[PDB]
Design a protein around this ligand. Structure first.
Ligand SMILES: CCCCCCCC/C=C/CCCCCCCC(=O)OC[C@H](COP(=O)(O)OCC[N+](C)(C)C)OC(=O)CCCCCCC/C=C/CCCCCCCC
Ligand SMILES: CCCCCCCC/C=C/CCCCCCCC(=O)OC[C@H](COP(=O)(O)OCC[N+](C)(C)C)OC(=O)CCCCCCC/C=C/CCCCCCCC
Ligand SMILES: CCCCCCCC/C=C\CCCCCCCC(=O)O[C@H](COC(=O)CCCCCCC/C=C/CCCCCCCC)COP(=O)(O)OCC[N+](C)(C)C
Ligand SMILES: CCCCCCCC/C=C\CCCCCCCC(=O)O[C@H](COC(=O)CCCCCCC/C=C/CCCCCCCC)COP(=O)(O)OCC[N+](C)(C)C
Ligand SMILES: Nc1ncnc2c1ncn2[C@@H]1O[C@H](COP(=O)(O)OP(=O)(O)OP(=O)(O)O)[C@@H](O)[C@H]1O
Ligand SMILES: Nc1ncnc2c1ncn2[C@@H]1O[C@H](COP(=O)(O)OP(=O)(O)OP(=O)(O)O)[C@@H](O)[C@H]1O
Ligand SMILES: Cn1c(=O)c2c(ncn2C)n(C)c1=O
Ligand SMILES: [Ca+2]
Ligand SMILES: [Zn+2]
Ligand SMILES: [Zn+2]
Lengths: 505, 48, 146, 48
């Protein structure tokens, strides 16, 4: 929860605005309250016994998801260390044979055991992710869809842009019986019906949301107490195919789940060919935070880097055109006089030669192509070489390196800005620490006691758990504003100390 | 009470009700309310 | 003191004491603090370079062995990539230090069925290892200065 | 330098009013004061 809080603070400070700051804070509080529910569920305390064992196993996997992920990295590293001993020979231990070459002889059985363990651990990692992290994804998706339905009328008054795939995919879940499975508001359908039932039509709203108006009345009329047996056939009947399809679409369109699926696919391929286990060594980027930041330095300006590579390609193409038109004679790369190997007798070969050799050469294409001394085009060709060296070897590679360095600087600046914003300004009211510090340790006291965001989250948890009939006046006030999604109760540019400055002094 | 009764009119005319502040001849800041035409608003909202 | 004592065993051990300039001179101390400010990041970058070179070694060992003969003599071939450990050592030792990457050392691919695959191999090696990663190290040092 | 120029423009627009030049700190005394001031009171679009 502390890591989530730090990430949320970084996000709001770096990217968020002031107008939506409190809304994002409340969204973070709702997500955290769900994460605490999931953590509480997974916390450690023949069909019935099988179900109990399944629940225990899934809870264990959810608890040890990160440990399983580190074990996967360790197993991949061990497998690759063993792979380092492979040798290729013509004779078995015309086709070439690959085989381990070690004196002990324990490596090959060890290699097989480690590969099987790695595949098992990858499968367990996928299951643990599905049981631990996917629920928050579904919760956030359902919450956003519910808010858009109720307050924006996304499928009632408006329609999806038809370029946003999320909105189009969300049409599947609207009429499903189990729409708010993870989201707390199980009455969102009726709230939407009441809000938009008059203008857009109650029957049409019911058709859109898969609602039964007679059932709406009968449920309030009297209670219903079904007691289905916990049988496999009953479970299969209870499955909601459309909702499951929507959920699977959401999951498969998730980056982390996709990464884990690719991990498992590569682990399976490793049994086809052991060297496919080398791909799993790329998991260090995701695992180690330091490497993640180092690679974020590169990926910060990835678009600019790719555009720079394209510009380099275009410039090399222009140089290739000039060389093909004028400097063909200098591109013979065969020492033998009888057989000349002319790289620039055709445009495609000349372009490949340039892009492949001149760019990689320290001094440019002139390091490779023939010396121009004593030639009628000597000055033209030395200008050609010098311009190639300066524009391609010097400036463009300098552009790439400068992009990387600027990415480093920008990321450091972002972190420093977040730290300074949190140290000098209050998160809730936004008043600067200079005003508070008039009193000794004023800012510290204000941010630890008066305006603690942790205290605000604890208030929401307290308001949800407390019975409504027991709510005090202020508690009922804040509760109504939370239910109406109005964030005016949050103090903005004001505080108790500023309100009662003269009296308090 | 009048404003609450006129919410619908105010909501309808919100896009077309422009307000600015100027330093008037009285040497005090004054608020001026004028009409923004739909064509003017659309032209201003054009991407170029 | 231990190195000074060892210097009497072998006079050349006194060369280690020349490292004392870093501790003595404040300017050199700051210059070296520029390097040590991001030492953890530099070490992680070196590890990432090792892993990337290992992946390139795996690909070369599986597909591009024929190009790794480093013996001019026809009778005696010196194949650097007939075993994974030798191929990895050859890569890490020669390709990283080469100005243009591993392709500067390994045989020319012209007129080969894998010519395009191997030129992509060489270009990607040059860009990811020689250009980007060394650029990452230099940028770390410059950011430490700043 | 180019990145600094872009960041300076963004910060200047976010922290200071384009027309009157008063800082957002004064306006934010009222809830969403700067936002209301720059969207309604002193909109350059409204001036045009
Ligand atoms: C951001 C981009 C970075 C750089 C882009 C790439 C630029 C690459 C070049 C740099 C300088 C190269 C020197 C130019 C060589 C001219 C050779 C020359 O003059 O030989 C005299 C010829 C004799 O004709 P011929 O009988 O031999 O064959 C003609 C018929 N054929 C061609 C098929 C058989 O007369 C003629 O062709 C008359 C002239 C023909 C048209 C000349 C245009 C060549 C392009 C020059 C680029 C201009 C920029 C240079 C400044 C450096 C960049 C800042
Ligand atoms: C951040 C990390 C930076 C970079 C990491 C290192 C990447 C290194 C590579 C770059 C491109 C190298 C080009 C790939 C060469 C493929 C050769 C090929 O296709 O030959 C056709 C073969 C014919 O089989 P065979 O009879 O000759 O022997 C097969 C059995 N054996 C293998 C033991 C005898 O068919 C086949 O094997 C079917 C294909 C086998 C599996 C291909 C997978 C090879 C890996 C490619 C890397 C993908 C990324 C490339 C993009 C550049 C990086 C951005
Ligand atoms: C961020 C940058 C991402 C780029 C990272 C690239 C890392 C590549 C480095 C190492 C892994 C590949 C090295 C080659 C292993 C030997 C291959 C071989 O040997 O192929 C041979 C051909 O089977 C195949 O192709 C299987 C089909 C593979 C389809 C290609 C799957 C995608 C390719 C992936 C490269 C890794 C993933 C990279 C991400 C790209 C996907 C999003 C297998 O061996 P065999 O025929 O002798 O059968 C030996 C066993 N028996 C005796 C049964 C007959
Ligand atoms: C911040 C980065 C730190 C790295 C800096 C490294 C600087 C190295 C540069 C210069 C100093 C060493 C150059 C070799 C001198 C000749 C050696 C030789 O000759 O060995 C020969 C073998 O005796 C030994 O080994 C003695 C045992 C030495 C144990 C090694 C101690 C640690 C090694 C240290 C290098 C310096 C300290 C670096 C910090 C690492 C420790 C924390 C001695 O000569 P001899 O057998 O002919 O007997 C000649 C006299 N009679 C004729 C009596 C028979
Ligand atoms: N409204 C606010 N509520 C809480 N802290 C605030 C607020 N406004 C500013 N801050 C500042 O945010 C910082 C919070 O401290 P910090 O994040 O280190 O807490 P922590 O409990 O140690 O959590 P973590 O270990 O996750 O960082 C303090 O410097 C505090 O002054
Ligand atoms: N006098 C002012 N008039 C308008 N905006 C001002 C003024 N002073 C400061 N600003 C700030 O300038 C920004 C204007 O918003 P922005 O430029 O994003 O508008 P937009 O209608 O989305 O236009 P565009 O899409 O072209 O950026 C806001 O952050 C606003 O607070
Ligand atoms: C805002 N909010 C919640 O965040 C919430 C809730 N019930 C559970 N949760 C998590 N209720 C009723 C609620 O109003
Ligand atoms: Ca009561
Ligand atoms: Zn405050
Ligand atoms: Zn103003």
């Amino acid at each position: 929860v502390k890591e989530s809080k730090r990430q949320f603070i970084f996000d709001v400070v770096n990217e968020g605005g002031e107008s939506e700051k409190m809304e994002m804070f409340v969204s973070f509080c709702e997500d955290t309250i769900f994460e605490m529910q999931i953590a509480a569920q997974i916390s450690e305390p023949f069909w019935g016994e099988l179900e109990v064992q399944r629940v225990k196993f899934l809870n264990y996997l959810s608890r040890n998801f990160y440990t399983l992920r580190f074990l996967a990295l360790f197993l991949a590293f061990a497998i690759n260390f063993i792979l380092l001993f492979y040798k290729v020979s013509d004779s078995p231990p015309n086709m070439v044979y690959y085989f381990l070459e070690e004196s002990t002889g324990y490596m090959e059985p060890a290699l097989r055991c480690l590969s099987l363990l790695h595949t098992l651990v990858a499968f367990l990692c996928i299951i643990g992710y599905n049981c631990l992290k996917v629920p928050l994804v579904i919760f956030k998706r359902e919450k956003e869809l519910a808010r858009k339905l109720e307050f924006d009328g996304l499928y009632i008054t408006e329609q999806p842009e038809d370029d946003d795939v999320k909105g189009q995919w969300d049409r599947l879940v609207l009429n499903t019986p189990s729409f708010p499975s993870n989201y707390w508001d199980k009455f969102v359908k009726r709230k939407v019906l009441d809000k938009h039932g008059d203008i857009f039509g109650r029957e049409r709203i019911a058709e859109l949301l898969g609602m039964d108006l007679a059932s709406l009345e009968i449920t309030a009329h009297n209670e219903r107490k079904p007691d289905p047996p916990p049988g496999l056939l009953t479970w299969i009947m209870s499955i909601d195919v459309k909702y499951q399809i929507w959920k699977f679409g959401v999951i498969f369109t998730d980056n982390s789940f996709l990464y884990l699926g690719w991990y498992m696919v590569m682990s399976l391929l490793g049994h086809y060919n052991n060297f496919f286990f080398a791909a799993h060594l790329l998991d260090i980027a995701m695992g180690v935070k330091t490497l993640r930041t180092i690679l974020s330095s590169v990926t910060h300006n990835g678009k600019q880097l790719v555009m720079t590579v394209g510009l380099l390609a275009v410039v090399v193409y222009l140089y290739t055109v000039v060389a093909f038109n004028f400097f063909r004679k200098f591109y013979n790369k065969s020492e033998d006089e009888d057989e000349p190997d002319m790289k620039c007798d055709d445009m495609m070969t000349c372009y490949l030669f340039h892009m492949y050799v001149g760019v990689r050469a320290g001094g440019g294409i002139g390091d490779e192509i023939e010396d121009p001394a004593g030639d009628e085009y000597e000055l033209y060709r030395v200008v050609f070489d010098i311009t190639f060296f300066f524009f391609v070897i010097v400036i463009l590679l300098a552009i790439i390196q400068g992009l990387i360095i600027d990415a480093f600087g920008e990321l450091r600046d972002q972190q420093e800005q977040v730290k300074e914003d949190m140290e000098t300004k209050c998160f809730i009211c936004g008043i600067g620490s200079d005003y508070f510090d008039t009193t000794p340790h004023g800012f510290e006291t204000h941010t630890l006691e008066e305006h603690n965001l942790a205290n605000y989250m604890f208030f929401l948890m307290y308001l949800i758990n407390k019975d409504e009939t027991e709510h005090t006046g202020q508690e009922s006030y804040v509760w109504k504003m939370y239910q109406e999604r109005c964030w005016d109760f949050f103090p903005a540019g004001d505080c108790f100390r500023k309100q009662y400055e003269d009296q308090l002094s | 009470n009048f404003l609450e009764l006129a919410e619908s009119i105010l909501e309808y005319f919100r896009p077309y009700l422009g307000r600015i502040e100027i330093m008037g001849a009285s040497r005090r800041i004054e608020r001026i309310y004028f009409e923004i035409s739909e064509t003017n608003r659309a032209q201003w909202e054009m991407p170029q």
